[PDB]
Amino acid sequence: SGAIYVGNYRVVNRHLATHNDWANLVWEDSSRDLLVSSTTAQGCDTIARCDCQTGVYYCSSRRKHYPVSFSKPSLIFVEASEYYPARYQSHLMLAVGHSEPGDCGGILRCQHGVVGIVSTGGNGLVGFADVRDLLWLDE
Ligand SMILES: NC(=O)[C@H]1CCCN(C(=O)[C@H](OCC2CCCC2)c2ccccc2)C1
Ligand SMILES: [Zn+2]
Numbered sequence: 847s848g849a850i851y852v853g854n855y856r857v858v859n860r861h862l863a864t865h866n867d868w869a870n871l872v873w874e875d876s877s878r879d880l881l882v883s884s885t886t887a888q889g890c891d892t893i894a895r896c897d898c899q900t901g902v903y904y905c906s907s908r909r910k911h912y913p914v915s916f917s918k919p920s921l922i923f924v925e926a927s928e929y930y931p932a933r934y935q936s937h938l939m940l941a942v943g944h945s946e947p948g949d950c951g952g953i954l955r956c957q958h959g960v961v962g963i964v965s966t967g968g969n970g971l972v973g974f975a976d977v978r979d980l981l982w983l984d985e
Contacts, residue, residue: 848904848951850960851889852983857882859950859965859975861929877936879965879975882983894958894978901956903964903972907946914941916954919976924966937976938965945972 850857858867860874860881867883874881899918902911916939924935939954945967952964954974966973977983 847906847948848953848963850891850893850953850963850977851885852891852893852960853889853985854885855882855889855983856885857963857977857983859963861927862950875936876930877933878938879930879935880977882980892959893980893983894956894961895981896956896958896961896978898956898958898961901954901961903941903943903954903974904952905944905964905972906949906952908944912943914943914954914972916941916974919979922973924973935966935973935975937979939974939976940966940971941974942970943972944970 860879863881870883872882902913919937921934921936922938926932949964954961962974962976965975
């Protein structure tokens, strides 16, 4: 679990969004595994606006942060689940690292701020849903 709080927005994994998230829906993209809902309290997370390929992510299944090198956002294949059919997830970045179910929502950060959130795992890889292109989160 985990979320990003920026301005009057809350960014979460779409497959973990709550009834309150869907009742205050601003935007969702199943192909990205992202959902953004509105909040009343102001958020103070800073979103990174960059092309970094190195950063640090929080891994809840190890209670630890790990430094990683990660790929540029791209269309990558993902298998089925209580949540999705086998499909290509867009705007996804992979790194070599530990990720298991429960780790979704962990934040990946670079020196510029929040880059994305854990969205996929397995086979010794971790995949992050990028949020750096969502320029509207800042206004
Ligand atoms: N964005 C998606 O479509 C994801 C939805 C949840 C599921 N998912 C995954 O990639 C992994 O879960 C299934 C594996 C298969 C073998 C053991 C569990 C996973 C998720 C999070 C962290 C680590 C691993 C795909
Ligand atoms: Zn950066």
